Amino acid sequence: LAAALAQAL
Ligand SMILES: *C(=O)c1ccc(-c2ccc(C(=O)OCC)cn2)nc1
Ligand SMILES: *NNC(=O)c1ccc(-c2ccc(C(N)=O)cn2)nc1
Ligand SMILES: CCc1ccccc1
Ligand SMILES: Cc1ccccc1C
């Protein structure tokens, strides 16, 4: 999940 969101940055 972290990566799925972190892709924004
Ligand atoms: C949410 O973005 C997210 C993505 C990927 C993972 C995750 C956890 C563990 C592995 C892995 O290969 O573990 C082997 C011990 C890969 N991806 N978690 C959360
Ligand atoms: N929000 N995105 C990031 O912080 C981020 C974007 C892209 C990458 C990344 C990592 C590794 C490669 C590669 N060719 O090995 C390319 N892009 N990391 C973080
Ligand atoms: C694509 C997720 C990510 C974001 C920032 C740094 C590394 C990786
Ligand atoms: C590992 C991680 C966690 C939360 C936001 C961004 C990144 C790259």
mmCIF file of N, CA, C and O and ligand atoms in Angstrom:
data_model
loop_
_atom_site.group_PDB
_atom_site.id
_atom_site.type_symbol
_atom_site.label_atom_id
_atom_site.label_comp_id
_atom_site.label_asym_id
_atom_site.label_seq_id
_atom_site.Cartn_x
_atom_site.Cartn_y
_atom_site.Cartn_z
ATOM 1 N N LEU A 1 0.817 -1.197 0.000
ATOM 2 C CA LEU A 1 0.000 0.000 0.000
ATOM 3 C C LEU A 1 0.860 1.260 0.000
ATOM 4 O O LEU A 1 0.568 2.207 -0.747
ATOM 5 N N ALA A 2 1.906 1.295 0.819
ATOM 6 C CA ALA A 2 2.768 2.461 0.873
ATOM 7 C C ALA A 2 3.226 2.836 -0.542
ATOM 8 O O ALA A 2 3.173 3.984 -0.964
ATOM 9 N N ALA A 3 3.738 1.854 -1.280
ATOM 10 C CA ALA A 3 4.242 2.128 -2.627
ATOM 11 C C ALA A 3 3.149 2.646 -3.559
ATOM 12 O O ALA A 3 3.395 3.541 -4.379
ATOM 13 N N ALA A 4 1.950 2.071 -3.443
ATOM 14 C CA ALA A 4 0.836 2.418 -4.297
ATOM 15 C C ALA A 4 0.512 3.911 -4.176
ATOM 16 O O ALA A 4 0.105 4.569 -5.133
ATOM 17 N N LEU A 5 0.685 4.450 -2.965
ATOM 18 C CA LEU A 5 0.461 5.867 -2.721
ATOM 19 C C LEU A 5 1.705 6.718 -3.030
ATOM 20 O O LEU A 5 1.609 7.784 -3.649
ATOM 21 N N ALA A 6 2.868 6.230 -2.586
ATOM 22 C CA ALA A 6 4.143 6.923 -2.678
ATOM 23 C C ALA A 6 4.539 7.262 -4.111
ATOM 24 O O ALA A 6 5.363 8.143 -4.358
ATOM 25 N N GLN A 7 3.965 6.544 -5.078
ATOM 26 C CA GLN A 7 4.261 6.827 -6.473
ATOM 27 C C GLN A 7 3.963 8.287 -6.849
ATOM 28 O O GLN A 7 4.557 8.787 -7.806
ATOM 29 N N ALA A 8 3.065 8.960 -6.132
ATOM 30 C CA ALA A 8 2.818 10.373 -6.333
ATOM 31 C C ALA A 8 4.128 11.200 -6.287
ATOM 32 O O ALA A 8 4.294 12.190 -6.991
ATOM 33 N N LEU A 9 5.052 10.798 -5.420
ATOM 34 C CA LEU A 9 6.335 11.491 -5.288
ATOM 35 C C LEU A 9 7.435 10.831 -6.085
ATOM 36 O O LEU A 9 8.355 11.469 -6.568
HETATM 37 C C1 LIG B 1 1.559 -1.343 -1.202
HETATM 38 O O1 LIG B 1 1.918 -0.510 -2.005
HETATM 39 C C2 LIG B 1 2.425 -2.569 -0.882
HETATM 40 C C3 LIG B 1 3.091 -2.983 -1.995
HETATM 41 C C4 LIG B 1 3.933 -4.073 -1.888
HETATM 42 C C5 LIG B 1 4.092 -4.685 -0.689
HETATM 43 C C6 LIG B 1 5.071 -5.837 -0.663
HETATM 44 C C7 LIG B 1 5.374 -6.449 0.526
HETATM 45 C C8 LIG B 1 6.310 -7.477 0.505
HETATM 46 C C9 LIG B 1 6.894 -7.819 -0.691
HETATM 47 C C10 LIG B 1 7.936 -8.973 -0.708
HETATM 48 O O2 LIG B 1 8.465 -9.310 -1.703
HETATM 49 O O3 LIG B 1 8.212 -9.582 0.546
HETATM 50 C C11 LIG B 1 9.016 -10.771 0.494
HETATM 51 C C12 LIG B 1 9.476 -11.089 1.941
HETATM 52 C C13 LIG B 1 6.558 -7.142 -1.848
HETATM 53 N N1 LIG B 1 5.666 -6.176 -1.782
HETATM 54 N N2 LIG B 1 3.440 -4.281 0.400
HETATM 55 C C14 LIG B 1 2.617 -3.226 0.334
HETATM 56 N N1 LIG B 2 7.203 9.443 -6.235
HETATM 57 N N2 LIG B 2 8.155 8.678 -6.879
HETATM 58 C C1 LIG B 2 9.418 8.385 -6.257
HETATM 59 O O1 LIG B 2 9.766 8.827 -5.206
HETATM 60 C C2 LIG B 2 10.266 7.471 -7.114
HETATM 61 C C3 LIG B 2 10.086 7.431 -8.497
HETATM 62 C C4 LIG B 2 10.877 6.589 -9.229
HETATM 63 C C5 LIG B 2 11.761 5.781 -8.560
HETATM 64 C C6 LIG B 2 12.632 4.875 -9.368
HETATM 65 C C7 LIG B 2 13.366 3.938 -8.681
HETATM 66 C C8 LIG B 2 14.207 3.102 -9.370
HETATM 67 C C9 LIG B 2 14.297 3.270 -10.737
HETATM 68 C C10 LIG B 2 15.250 2.324 -11.487
HETATM 69 N N3 LIG B 2 15.409 2.443 -12.916
HETATM 70 O O2 LIG B 2 15.850 1.495 -10.883
HETATM 71 C C11 LIG B 2 13.547 4.243 -11.382
HETATM 72 N N4 LIG B 2 12.746 5.029 -10.677
HETATM 73 N N5 LIG B 2 11.898 5.825 -7.243
HETATM 74 C C12 LIG B 2 11.169 6.637 -6.502
HETATM 75 C C1 LIG B 3 7.131 4.298 -6.880
HETATM 76 C C2 LIG B 3 7.207 4.364 -5.354
HETATM 77 C C3 LIG B 3 8.405 5.131 -4.868
HETATM 78 C C4 LIG B 3 8.310 6.482 -4.527
HETATM 79 C C5 LIG B 3 9.418 7.188 -4.077
HETATM 80 C C6 LIG B 3 10.647 6.550 -3.960
HETATM 81 C C7 LIG B 3 10.753 5.207 -4.295
HETATM 82 C C8 LIG B 3 9.640 4.506 -4.746
HETATM 83 C C1 LIG B 4 8.885 4.251 1.365
HETATM 84 C C2 LIG B 4 7.924 5.376 1.390
HETATM 85 C C3 LIG B 4 6.939 5.472 2.370
HETATM 86 C C4 LIG B 4 6.040 6.521 2.357
HETATM 87 C C5 LIG B 4 6.149 7.481 1.360
HETATM 88 C C6 LIG B 4 7.144 7.377 0.391
HETATM 89 C C7 LIG B 4 8.043 6.326 0.385
HETATM 90 C C8 LIG B 4 9.114 6.184 -0.667
#
